[PDB]
Design an enzyme around this catalytic site. Structure first.
Site, PDB file in Angstrom:
ATOM      1  N   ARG A   1       0.843  -1.199   0.000  1.00  0.00           N
ATOM      2  CA  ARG A   1       0.000   0.000   0.000  1.00  0.00           C
ATOM      3  C   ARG A   1       0.873   1.241   0.000  1.00  0.00           C
ATOM      4  O   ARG A   1       1.661   1.498   0.911  1.00  0.00           O
ATOM      5  CB  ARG A   1      -0.938  -0.003   1.215  1.00  0.00           C
TER       6      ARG A   1
ATOM      7  N   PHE B   1       1.772  10.785   1.093  1.00  0.00           N
ATOM      8  CA  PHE B   1       1.343  10.272   2.405  1.00  0.00           C
ATOM      9  C   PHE B   1       2.428   9.336   2.948  1.00  0.00           C
ATOM     10  O   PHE B   1       3.231   9.707   3.804  1.00  0.00           O
ATOM     11  CB  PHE B   1       0.000   9.579   2.299  1.00  0.00           C
TER      12      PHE B   1
ATOM     13  N   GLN C   1       3.569   1.696   2.870  1.00  0.00           N
ATOM     14  CA  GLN C   1       3.292   0.734   3.947  1.00  0.00           C
ATOM     15  C   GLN C   1       3.617  -0.700   3.558  1.00  0.00           C
ATOM     16  O   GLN C   1       3.378  -1.147   2.433  1.00  0.00           O
ATOM     17  CB  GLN C   1       1.820   0.846   4.316  1.00  0.00           C
TER      18      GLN C   1
ATOM     19  N   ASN D   1      -1.788  -0.136  12.179  1.00  0.00           N
ATOM     20  CA  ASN D   1      -2.559  -0.902  13.171  1.00  0.00           C
ATOM     21  C   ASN D   1      -4.024  -0.949  12.768  1.00  0.00           C
ATOM     22  O   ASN D   1      -4.403  -0.390  11.735  1.00  0.00           O
ATOM     23  CB  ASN D   1      -2.402  -0.316  14.568  1.00  0.00           C
TER      24      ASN D   1
ATOM     25  N   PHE E   1       4.704   1.728   8.375  1.00  0.00           N
ATOM     26  CA  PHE E   1       4.798   2.614   7.203  1.00  0.00           C
ATOM     27  C   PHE E   1       5.951   3.574   7.388  1.00  0.00           C
ATOM     28  O   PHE E   1       6.418   3.885   8.481  1.00  0.00           O
ATOM     29  CB  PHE E   1       3.510   3.377   6.946  1.00  0.00           C
TER      30      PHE E   1
ATOM     31  N   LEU F   1      -1.591  11.696  12.750  1.00  0.00           N
ATOM     32  CA  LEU F   1      -1.530  10.315  13.241  1.00  0.00           C
ATOM     33  C   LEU F   1      -0.932  10.274  14.646  1.00  0.00           C
ATOM     34  O   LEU F   1      -0.878   9.210  15.260  1.00  0.00           O
ATOM     35  CB  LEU F   1      -0.692   9.415  12.331  1.00  0.00           C
TER      36      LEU F   1
ATOM     37  N   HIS G   1      -0.606   6.194  16.143  1.00  0.00           N
ATOM     38  CA  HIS G   1       0.369   5.222  15.666  1.00  0.00           C
ATOM     39  C   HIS G   1       1.666   5.372  16.438  1.00  0.00           C
ATOM     40  O   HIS G   1       2.127   6.474  16.727  1.00  0.00           O
ATOM     41  CB  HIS G   1       0.581   5.388  14.149  1.00  0.00           C
TER      42      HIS G   1
HETATM   43 AU   LIG Z   1      -4.410   6.109  12.276  1.00  0.00          AU
END
Ligand SMILES: [Au+]
Length: 172
Positions: free
Chosen positions: A62, A67, A70, A109, A120, A129, A133
């Site tokens: 991904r 961004f 991952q 997660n 990632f 985030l 995370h």
């Molecule tokens: Au998140």
């Protein structure tokens, strides 16, 4: 504790594309860093899944431009699998470190306390985030290799071609 250094040698569509070197925050999040380090060396062998606890051979499944990239799903390769060396899922260790910019390494997660092997690498600052995370390392060499993988991502998350962790391990 002293900070581990690990690496990924990347292929893109089978073509050698360089090495990403990462520093882990063993001193800040030892359980989280120790999980990733061992998945780089493969030292804990075959996991409960029956597959190796090892990033080698796995892909960035991904990849979203502007961004992050991952990976870490070496059991299903699609975002639904992965396994920590502890065996399934472990709690968020702490949120001391934040998503400050490109190069940040953090855990993927499925909500609170669901860390596995998926992770990632940020290609932008992803402040939204923070506290959701666990951040446990950063890229210190090869950010250009991270950009190359990023160039093969789509808004949809699906990669244009296979971005593989062809080799990986720990540096002394
Ligand atoms: Au998140």
């Amino acid at each position: 504790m002293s900070r581990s250094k690990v690496f990924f040698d990347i292929t893109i569509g089978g073509k050698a594309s360089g090495r990403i070197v990462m520093e882990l925050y063993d001193d800040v999040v030892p359980k989280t860093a120790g999980n990733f380090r061992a998945l780089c060396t493969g030292e804990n062998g075959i996991g409960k899944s029956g597959k190796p606890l090892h990033f080698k051979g796995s892909k960035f499944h991904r990849i979203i431009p502007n961004f992050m990239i991952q990976g870490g799903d070496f059991t299903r390769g699609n975002g639904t699998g992965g396994e920590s060396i502890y065996g399934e899922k472990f709690p968020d260790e702490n949120f001391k470190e934040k998503h400050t910019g490109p190069g940040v390494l953090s855990m993927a997660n499925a909500g609170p306390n669901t860390n596995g092997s998926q992770f990632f690498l940020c290609t932008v600052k992803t402040e939204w985030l923070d506290g959701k995370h666990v951040v446990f390392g950063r890229v210190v060499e090869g950010l250009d290799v991270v950009k190359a993988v990023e160039s093969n991502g789509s808004q949809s998350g699906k990669p244009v071609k296979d971005c593989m962790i062809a080799d990986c391990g720990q540096l002394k």
